[PDB]
């Protein structure tokens, strides 16, 4: 059956672990464990298409952040999270692009913009500031939440999407 590569990026702290683990596990991990590098391989049906998903998710921590660009190379597309109460993350969307953009060698990189924590409080990225950033990279942006699950399989899926129009 058809694989498709998934790679989760950005800062850490965003929940790129959490996102991945309610997709992949149906439930919130509430803790803080930095990731080093972790994958997670499922069997689902995408637009009817009985498929395996192996997601890398990566290190957000410059500590722990070591071979991430090796693990990067595979992959077929990227989910660059941050998050909408985290303006840096936000910001530094741009490093994962430039740093997906050098592992892949190329500008045309499937890729979708992902906020997470949409159920946070303190929001400070406002949806229409990460719509422009999305626009001006020619791909969708999601609202997320780890906690509530809400747009945790349409983030995925829509990548999945994303590769397909490659
Ligand atoms: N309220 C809320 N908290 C979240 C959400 N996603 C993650 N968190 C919380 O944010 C913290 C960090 O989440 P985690 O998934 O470990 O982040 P990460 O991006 O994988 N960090 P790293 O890059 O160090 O591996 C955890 O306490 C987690 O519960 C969310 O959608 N909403
Ligand atoms: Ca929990
Ligand atoms: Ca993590
Ligand atoms: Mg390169
Ligand atoms: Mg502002
Ligand atoms: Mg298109
Ligand atoms: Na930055």
Redesign the pocket.
């Given at each position: 059956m058809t694989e498709y590569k998934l790679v989760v990026v950005?800062?850490?702290?965003?929940?790129?672990?959490?996102?991945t683990?309610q997709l992949i596990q149906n439930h919130?991990?509430?803790?803080?464990?930095?990731?080093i590098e972790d994958s997670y391989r499922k069997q689902v049906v995408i637009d009817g298409e009985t498929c395996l998903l192996d997601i890398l998710?990566?290190?957000?921590?410059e500590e722990?952040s070591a071979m991430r660009d090796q693990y990067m190379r595979t992959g077929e597309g990227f989910l660059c999270?941050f998050?909408i109460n985290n303006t840096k993350s936000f910001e530094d969307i741009h490093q994962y692009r430039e740093q997906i953009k050098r592992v892949k060698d190329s500008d045309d990189v499937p890729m979708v913009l992902v906020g997470?924590?949409?159920?946070?409080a303190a929001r400070t990225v406002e949806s229409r500031q990460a719509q422009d950033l999305a626009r001006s990279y020619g791909i969708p942006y999601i609202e997320?939440?780890?906690?509530?699950r809400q747009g945790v399989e349409d983030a995925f899926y829509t990548l999945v999407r994303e590769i397909r129009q490659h």
């Amino acid at each position: 059956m058809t694989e498709y590569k998934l790679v989760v990026v950005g800062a850490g702290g965003v929940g790129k672990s959490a996102l991945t683990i309610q997709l992949i596990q149906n439930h919130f991990v509430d803790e803080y464990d930095p990731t080093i590098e972790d994958s997670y391989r499922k069997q689902v049906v995408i637009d009817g298409e009985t498929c395996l998903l192996d997601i890398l998710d990566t290190a957000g921590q410059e500590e722990y952040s070591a071979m991430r660009d090796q693990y990067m190379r595979t992959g077929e597309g990227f989910l660059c999270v941050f998050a909408i109460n985290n303006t840096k993350s936000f910001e530094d969307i741009h490093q994962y692009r430039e740093q997906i953009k050098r592992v892949k060698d190329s500008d045309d990189v499937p890729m979708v913009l992902v906020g997470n924590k949409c159920d946070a409080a303190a929001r400070t990225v406002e949806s229409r500031q990460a719509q422009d950033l999305a626009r001006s990279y020619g791909i969708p942006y999601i609202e997320t939440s780890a906690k509530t699950r809400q747009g945790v399989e349409d983030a995925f899926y829509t990548l999945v999407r994303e590769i397909r129009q490659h």
